[PDB]
């Protein structure tokens, strides 16, 4: 019975969420990721769990309402990596009238069930604010921040938690129907080891590659086109000490975020640039930098230059091509397509789908796949808690409680584990009783005990996986220290 019930191609947020949900419904599931979990679009987001305020002008009510309500659901599912955040919108009357803004905020507050997130409010900016003097009025509202790459990992762990299988660095090369079953072929991108599996169902959740897999992997016609819209972000030492984020209205009608990041930086993003080519080669261009710095510099007193940038990242949104002439106007809602052959071997493909709406998307996916499976269990993820989320507060409790239980833990390290691993911290600490038991110090309190844990429980294979996806330690480790991390991984993944 080597036949899996469902095979999921794609290890980003959408593929992980679908696989986890499926496994939790009793299906024998296998998820395939060509490189590393969240190595593409899912680790290149603005990292916000938002309802999509700007989509209201386009009347995308279905998406905005679903997104808004999911915020609190995700907040309870992964309290260790997600949390409430307040956003400040500077008023720019020549762009949008005050009455217009208020209507939007009203919908944003009632368009979706809001049990804990505070309501919107008006703001007054004085001569001592961070914004320029001419800007005197604004508004503030709620939304959430989430460690995108880690939300993906949490779901991958869930898959395994429920008897599922997850393979990384394994690229699916082909898939075709045969005798009522799917024959999926894949190969280890490193060793060349080939695999061949049989499945009763197949999900194409390869994001930017969705159509590409239809053409080269299955030789089947894709039900939808895909618009690749690149978006980049720049990182700089925090521009101010305030805990809230700002949402700026640019002259082209787009909005740009300035978000507090890891207490030391500010993330500024994003952009909408039509893109063509390999989604893996995407990178920020000069005009993007000029565009993000300008909108920031026109709003804040403290001026930023190109020289203040400490890091940048970019990714491409795989938006379902609605033929919109304007990249910023293209819809952000997702579309799912399911098709079978003679009532068997269904194929569910995913087009679009924000990180914010992934759980709902995954639920709707299993809904379409239900008719094809035995006594498949019903929905369940809404009342679940992702691995690492079984805490009691986050900072409120966990970080404090961790140092209390593991006194040798400095306040910074305790904060890191709490905000990264959550309830999985005790598994990482194992029998450690002192700092020395944590092993080699690679820098910035990133110990061997953490890296060993990442390889054993978080599929880490390369340094980048560990320093830029499972964590953001890459922001502090110098070139030699990162080289050492890679060297350790070789020696550990060797024998």
Ligand X SMILES: Cc1cc2nc3c(=O)[nH]c(=O)nc-3n(C[C@H](O)[C@H](O)[C@H](O)COP(=O)(O)OP(=O)(O)OC[C@H]3O[C@@H](n4cnc5c(N)ncnc54)[C@H](O)[C@@H]3O)c2cc1C
Ligand Y SMILES: CCCCCCCCO[C@@H]1O[C@H](CO)[C@@H](O)[C@H](O)[C@H]1O
Ligand Z SMILES: O=S(=O)(O)CCCNC(CO)(CO)CO
| Residues engaged in binding ligand Y (CB under 6 A) | 53-54, 56-57, 89, 91, 93, 97-104, 106, 136-137, 249, 255
**Least distance between ligand Z and beta carbon 443 (Å):** 22
Q: Which is nearer to ligand Y, 54 or 114 (CB)?
A: 54
Q: How many residues form the binding site for ligand Z (CB under 6 A)?
A: 9
Residue with tokens 């890091």: 311
- The closest alpha carbon to 233, from 260, 282, 268, belongs to 268
329 annotated to a ligand binding site: no
Q: For the CB of residue 10, give the shortest distance to ligand Z in the complex, in Å.
A: 18
- Which residue, 364, 417, 342, 358, is CA-closest to 177? 342
Q: Does 163 bind ligand Z (CB under 6 A)?
A: no
Q: Is 112 annotated as a binding residue?
A: no
Which of 138, 164, 201, 231 is the binder for ligand X (CB under 6 A)? 231
**62 burial level (CB within 10 Å; 0-12, 13-18, 19+):** exposed
Which residue's CB is nearer to ligand Y, number 106 or number 380? Answer: 106
* Distance from C-alpha of 115 to C-alpha of 134, rounded to nearest angstrom: 36
Stretch touching ligand Z by CB under 6 A, among 74-82, 154-162, 268-276, 487-495: 154-162
Stretch that binds ligand Z, among 109-117, 142-150, 235-243, 454-462 (CB under 6 A): 454-462
What are the φ and ψ backbone dihedral angles of 289, each rounded to 5 degrees? -60, -45
CB of 317 to ligand Y, least distance (A): 17
Q: Choosing among ligand Y, ligand X, ligand Z, none, which partner's interface includes residue 415 (Cβ < 5 to 8 Å by kind)? A: none
Question: Does residue 270 have a cis bond before it (omega within 30 degrees)?
Answer: yes
Q: Which is nearer to ligand Z, 41 or 423 (CB)?
A: 423
Q: Is 375 flagged in the annotation as binding?
A: no
Least distance to ligand Y, CB of residue 237, Å: 27
**How far apart are the C-alpha atoms of 417 and 409, rounded to whole Å?**
10
32 is in an annotated binding site: yes
Residue 57 contacts ligand Z per CB under 6 A: no
Which residue's CB is nearer to ligand X, number 11 or number 104? 11
Choose one: 13-21, 107-115, 246-254, 448-456; the region binding ligand X (CB under 6 A).
13-21
Residue 27 assigned to a binding site: yes
**Does residue 387 touch ligand Z according to CB under 6 A?**
yes
Residue 101 or residue 146: which is nearer to ligand Y going by CB?
101
Q: Which residue has the tokens 């990721």?
A: 33
The Cα 447–Cα 425 span in angstroms is 13
Q: Are 452 and 493 in contact (CB under 8 A)?
A: no
Strands (E), 238-292: 245-249, 255-261, 265-269, 273-274
Give the pair of three-digit tokens for residue 87: 């956003």
Pairwise CA distance, residues 17 & 10, whole Å: 10
Q: Least distance to ligand X from the beta carbon of 275, Å?
A: 10
Q: Does residue 389 have a cis peptide bond before it, meaning omega lies within 30 degrees of 0?
A: no
474 is in an annotated binding site: no
Among 184, 458, 465, 471, which residue interacts with ligand Z (rule: CB under 6 A)?
458
Cβ-closest residue to ligand X?
12
User: What does DSSP say about strands 121-124 and 137-146: parallel, antiparallel, or unpaired?
Assistant: antiparallel
Instruction: Decide: 171 and 186 in contact? Cβ < 8 Å.
Output: yes
Among 457, 475, 476, 492, binds ligand Z (CB under 6 A): 457
Do the annotations mark residue 11 as ligand-binding?
yes
Distance from C-alpha of 286 to C-alpha of 112, rounded to nearest angstrom? 39
Is residue 143 a contact partner of residue 51, using CB atoms and an 8 Å limit? yes
In angstroms, the CA 338 to CA 348 distance is 4
Q: Work out whether 197 is an interface residue with ligand Z (CB under 6 A).
A: no
> Are 106 and 112 within 8 A, CB to CB?
no
The answer to whether the annotation marks 204 as part of a ligand binding site is: no
Q: Would you count residue 142 as binding ligand X (CB under 6 A)?
A: no
Would the annotation count 202 as a binding residue?
no
Q: Of 79, 112, 327, 353, which lies in the binding site for ligand X, with binding defined by CB under 6 A?
A: 353
> According to the annotation, is 167 in a ligand binding site?
no
Q: How far is CA 265 from CA 43, 150, 310, 412, in A?
A: 17, 19, 9, 16
Looking only at residues 355 through 394 of this chain, which bind ligand X when binding is defined by CB under 6 A? 355-356
Known binding residue 100? Answer is no
Binding-site ranges for ligand Z (CB under 6 A): 157, 160-161, 387, 455-459
Residue ranges for the known binding site for FAD are 5-33
Residue ranges for the known binding site are 5-33
């Amino acid at each position: 019975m080597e036949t899996k019930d469902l095979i999921v191609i794609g290890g980003g947020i959408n593929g992980a969420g679908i696989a986890a949900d499926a496994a939790g419904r009793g299906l024998s599931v296998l998820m395939l990721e060509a490189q590393d979990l969240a190595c593409a679009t899912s680790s290149a987001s603005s990292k916000l769990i938002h309802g999509g305020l700007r989509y209201l002008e386009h009347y995308e009510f279905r998406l905005v309402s679903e997104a808004l309500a999911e915020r609190e659901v995700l907040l309870k599912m992964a309290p260790h990596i997600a949390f409430p955040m307040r956003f400040r919108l500077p008023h720019r009357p020549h762009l949008r009238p005050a009455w217009m803004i208020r209507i939007g905020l009203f919908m944003y507050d009632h368009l979706g069930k809001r049990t804990s997130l505070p309501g919107s409010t008006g703001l007054r900016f004085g001569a001592n604010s961070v914004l320029k003097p001419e800007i005197k009025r604004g508004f503030e509202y709620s939304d959430c921040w989430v460690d995108d790459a880690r939300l993906v990992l949490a779901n991958a762990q869930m898959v395994v938690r429920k008897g599922g299988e997850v393979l990384t660095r394994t690229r699916a090369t082909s898939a075709r129907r045969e005798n009522g079953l799917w024959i999926v072929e894949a190969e280890d991108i490193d060793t060349g080891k080939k695999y061949s599996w049989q499945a009763r169902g197949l999900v194409n959740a390869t994001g930017p590659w969705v159509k590409q897999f239809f053409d080269d992997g299955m030789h089947l016609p894709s039900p939808y086109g895909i618009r690749l819209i690149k978006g980049s972000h720049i990182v700089v030492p925090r521009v101010h000490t305030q805990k809230q984020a700002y949402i700026l209205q640019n002259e082209d009608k787009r909005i740009v975020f300035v978000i507090p990041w890891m207490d030391e930086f500010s993330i500024i993003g994003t952009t909408d640039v039509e893109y063509k080519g390999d989604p893996k080669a995407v990178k920020i261009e000069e005009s993007e930098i000029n565009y993000l710095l300008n909108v920031y510099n026109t709003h804040f007193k403290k001026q930023l230059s190109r020289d203040d940038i400490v890091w940048t990242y970019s990714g491409v949104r795989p938006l379902c091509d609605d033929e919109s002439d304007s990249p910023q106007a293209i819809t952000r809602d997702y579309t799912l397509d399911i098709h079978d052959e003679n009532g068997k071997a269904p194929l569910l493909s995913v087009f679009g789908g924000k990180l914010t709406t992934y759980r709902k998307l995954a639920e709707h996916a299993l809904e379409k796949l239900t008719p094809y499976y035995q006594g498949i269990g019903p929905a369940w993820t809404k009342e679940s808690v992702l691995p690492g989320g079984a805490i009691e507060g986050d900072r409120d409790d966990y970080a404090a409680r961790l140092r209390r239980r593991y006194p040798f833990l400095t306040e910074s390290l305790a904060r890191h584990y709490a905000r990264t691993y959550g309830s999985n911290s005790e598994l990482l600490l194992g029998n450690a009783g002192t700092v020395s038991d944590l092993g080699e110090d690679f820098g910035h309190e990133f110990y061997e005990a953490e890296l060993k844990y990442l390889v054993d429980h978080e599929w880490v294979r390369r340094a980048d996986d560990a320093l830029w996806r499972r964590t953001k330690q890459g922001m502090w480790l110098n070139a030699d220290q990162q080289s050492r991390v890679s060297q350790w991984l070789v020696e550990y993944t060797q024998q």
